[PDB]
Amino acid sequence: YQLMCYYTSWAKDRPIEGSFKPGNIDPCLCTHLIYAFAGMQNNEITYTHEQDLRDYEALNGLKDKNTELKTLLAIGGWKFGPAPFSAMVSTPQNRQIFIQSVIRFLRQYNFDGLNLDWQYPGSRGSPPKDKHLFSVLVKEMRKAFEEESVEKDIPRLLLTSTGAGIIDVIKSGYKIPELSQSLDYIQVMTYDLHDPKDGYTGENSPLYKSPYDIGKSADLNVDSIISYWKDHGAASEKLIVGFPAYGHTFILSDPSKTGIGAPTISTGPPGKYTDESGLLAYYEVCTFLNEGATEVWDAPQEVPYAYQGNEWVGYDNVRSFKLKAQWLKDNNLGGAVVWPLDMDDFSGSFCHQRHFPLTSTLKGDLNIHSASC
């Protein structure tokens, strides 16, 4: 199995206590490290901030400590949006410019591959034709990577892409059989499945549906999402399940109604370190628990939730990661990806479960152990 781990560039800018630098990642913890976000300029991949170059150096330097470790550079993300991608895939000229820039960039900075994270071909403004054009881009990129590998007699660069977790988004943006032919891995975004804008409490990454889920909501769970991808042609071994190292917060309409599906008013207040209304890093959830929140296990979905006064949080803990890891193995999947590693309790200071409690759980349960480690 693979255990991929995202490192986000902005994690180092948080208050020192929550600040995380790529060079401080345990080199033996994961099989792949993914640097979250390269930018794009004139249809070419590039850095988002010039200081990112130092990050690349530190991140890839970890490979001297774990010779089997691979690194990937991700481009895109939710905030980036679809527009730059729509323009880049619109013509053969633009795609060639992009593909060649990727090979040059990854080889220059010692990355082993690319992680395409177009948040969404076919939706959010991206026209229907982008479902086909995204597939064309992926096929052309894979071909170029194969050709470069043969010409230089070195291992081929890896090509991966995120895959939506929302069914309607999968339908409008992904030619699954074609994409599965050309991609090495598909990182399925099995997270952010329920959020405050729903009007009721809901889990971030439930394994199974809640008995309260109705209609399309009954598909907002890991099992249903992965089943959809497989039923539509994705190679099971290429599917990498998303494991969130954070939860979502809600303000309860009634502090007496605290279960799944309870009415809510809005997102909860931002955490001290992550500063994002509606979200808390796993380490911030540990603080919430330590300071008195009532913790409950939701067996139907096999994930925890906690509440204090009118604040409710749906998240993932060691037990939910363990159960999902077993399920992943039972379903012959390719592995897991922790999103984002910088929100796990990397210092061990917040949860008292040692360093990287969530990710370490997956390392053990997925039998991750490289020869040089």
From Swiss-Prot:
Pfam families named among the record's database cross-references: Glyco_hydro_18
Lineage top rank: taxon: Eukaryota
Ranges where the GH18 domain occurs: 1-369
Enzyme class: hydrolase
UniProt binding sites for chitin: 49-50, 76-79, 120, 189-192, 339
Record EC number: 3.2.1.52
Induction: Up-regulated in response to IL3 and IL4, during the inflammatory response and upon parasitic infection.
Annotated localization: Secreted; Rough endoplasmic reticulum lumen; Nucleus envelope; Cytoplasm
Primary location recorded for the protein, binned into one broad class: secreted
GO molecular function, one term: chitin binding
Record has Protein transport as a keyword: no
Catalytic activity field: Hydrolysis of terminal non-reducing N-acetyl-D-hexosamine residues in N-acetyl-beta-D-hexosaminides
Disulphide linkage map: 5-30, 28-373, 286-351
GO terms for cellular component: cytoplasm; cytoplasmic vesicle; extracellular region; nuclear envelope; rough endoplasmic reticulum lumen
Functional pH dependence: Optimum pH is 4.5-5.0.
Physiological role: Lectin that binds saccharides with a free amino group, such as glucosamine or galactosamine. Binding to oligomeric saccharides is much stronger than binding to mono- or disaccharides. Also binds chitin and heparin. Has weak hexosaminidase activity but no chitinase activity. Has chemotactic activity for T-lymphocytes, bone marrow cells and eosinophils. May play a role in inflammation and allergy.
Family: Belongs to the glycosyl hydrolase 18 family. Chitinase class II subfamily.
Name of the protein: Chitinase-like protein 3
Naturally occurring in which organism (per UniProt): Mus musculus (Mouse)
Lineage: Eukaryota, Metazoa, Chordata, Craniata, Vertebrata
